[PDB]
Amino acid sequence: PFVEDWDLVQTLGEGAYGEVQLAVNREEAVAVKIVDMPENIKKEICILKMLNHENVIKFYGHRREGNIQYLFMELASGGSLFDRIEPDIGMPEPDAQRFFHQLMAGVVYLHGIGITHRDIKPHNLLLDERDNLKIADYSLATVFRYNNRERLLNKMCGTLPYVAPELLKRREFHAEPVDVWSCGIVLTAMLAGELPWDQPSDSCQEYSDWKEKKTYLNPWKKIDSAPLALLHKILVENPSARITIPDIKKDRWYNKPLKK
Ligand SMILES: CC(C)(O)[C@@H]1CCN(c2cc(-n3ncc4ccc([C@]5(C#N)CC56CC6)cc43)ncn2)C1
């Protein structure tokens, strides 16, 4: 089979709607999101067109073939952050810091254009030729600010180990602290090679242990005091008490010089 001049070589990953494939021309290699069948694809295309930043995946354009929609994006040659996390170990702290600084740069950019990602996790954080982080998958992205006016979110979505606790508890909630929370779980995964809990709920023992400051337990015991102090400010239950990105940028570990 062929679409204009493209050949489907390898499945790069799956999302809530459709599949992302590695497409080779006749010999340019690109990433194509193939979606069957409406209100959501019009929204995703719209958000994808607004994006212009070094830490956000580049959108090439879109083609329609009846019921099938093709979304063309720049191929992340370095693959995903997920495959740089050694299970039970994580990665060297200077590499985790650099990826965290790049994650903050991409999230400030999105929030600045009033877009919330809503599914930040290592499979959605890709790497270019020079290991520069790029935030991908905008199928769950939505507008939280328009005409300088904030809109609260009221839809439950994301990935349970990464979702903020207010998302499971409150009818309506602010967008930005939810994305901040998921960034904190990503930081935990980079420094410990393990996710801290199945979900941030009272029925989850590991979440209860964190709230009781049992930081002598895994994954926290694998993390050095300085990044752990940052995680203590991010992984705060009350979203109004949770650290904001301007203040993460002032954190001691965020500003620590690191090498080797
Ligand atoms: C062949 C090569 C160069 O060796 C490498 C081998 C692993 N590779 C990749 C590349 C990607 N890319 N690249 C661009 C791109 C855009 C969107 C998405 C996503 C969405 N939506 C997150 C999700 C669902 C996958 C992925 C993308 N995803 C994984 N691995 C490429």
> How many folded domains does the chain comprise?
2
Side-by-side strand order, sheet with 68-73: 7-14, 19-24, 29-36, 68-73, 59-65
Query: Residue type for 249, please?
Result: K
Residue finishing a domain among 63, 86, 109: 86
Do 150 and 169 fall into the same domain? yes
Pocket of ligand 1 (CB under 6 A): 12-13, 15, 20, 22, 31, 33, 57, 73, 75-77, 79-80, 124, 126, 136-137
End-to-end Cα spacing for the chain: 48
Residue closest via CA to ligand 1's atom 1 equals: 77
150: CA distance to ligand 1 center in Å?
32
Do 176 and 223 fall into the same domain? yes
Do 213 and 104 fall into the same domain? yes
Do 257 and 161 fall into the same domain? yes
| Contacts of residue 169, Cβ cutoff 8 Å, sequence gap at least 6 | none
- Of the candidates 119, 179, 224, 251, the residue annotated as catalytic is 119
Do 70 and 158 fall into the same domain? no
Residue 202 is among the residues annotated as catalytic for this protein: no
Using CA atoms, how far apart are residues 208 and 201, in angstroms rounded to an integer? 8
Do 122 and 165 fall into the same domain? yes
For the beta carbon of residue 7, count every other beta carbon within 10 angstroms: 14
Using CA atoms, how far apart are residues 174 and 240, in angstroms rounded to an integer? 9
214: CA distance to ligand 1 center in Å?
37
Q: Which of 126, 133, 137 has most ligand 1 atoms within 8 Å of CB, for mutation?
A: 126
Do 161 and 106 fall into the same domain? yes
Residue finishing a domain among 61, 86, 111: 86
Residues 38/51, Cβ–Cβ less than 8 Å = no
Distances in whole angstroms, Cα of residue 259 to Cα of each of 55, 82, 169, 246: 22, 22, 41, 24
Do 26 and 107 fall into the same domain? no
Could you tell me which of 211, 199, 144 has the C-alpha nearest to residue 172?
Answer: 144
Residue 223 DSSP SS3: coil
Residue finishing a domain among 86, 103, 122: 86
Atom of ligand 1 nearest to the CA of 139: 21
Paired strand residues for 3: 6
Q: Which domain holds residue 42?
A: 1-86
Do 64 and 96 fall into the same domain? no
Do 176 and 227 fall into the same domain? yes
Q: How was this structure determined?
A: X-ray
76: CA distance to ligand 1 center in Å?
6
239: CA distance to ligand 1 center in Å?
32
Do 93 and 121 fall into the same domain? yes
Residue 175 DSSP SS3: helix
Do 100 and 43 fall into the same domain? no
What's CA 250's distance to the chain center, in Å?
22
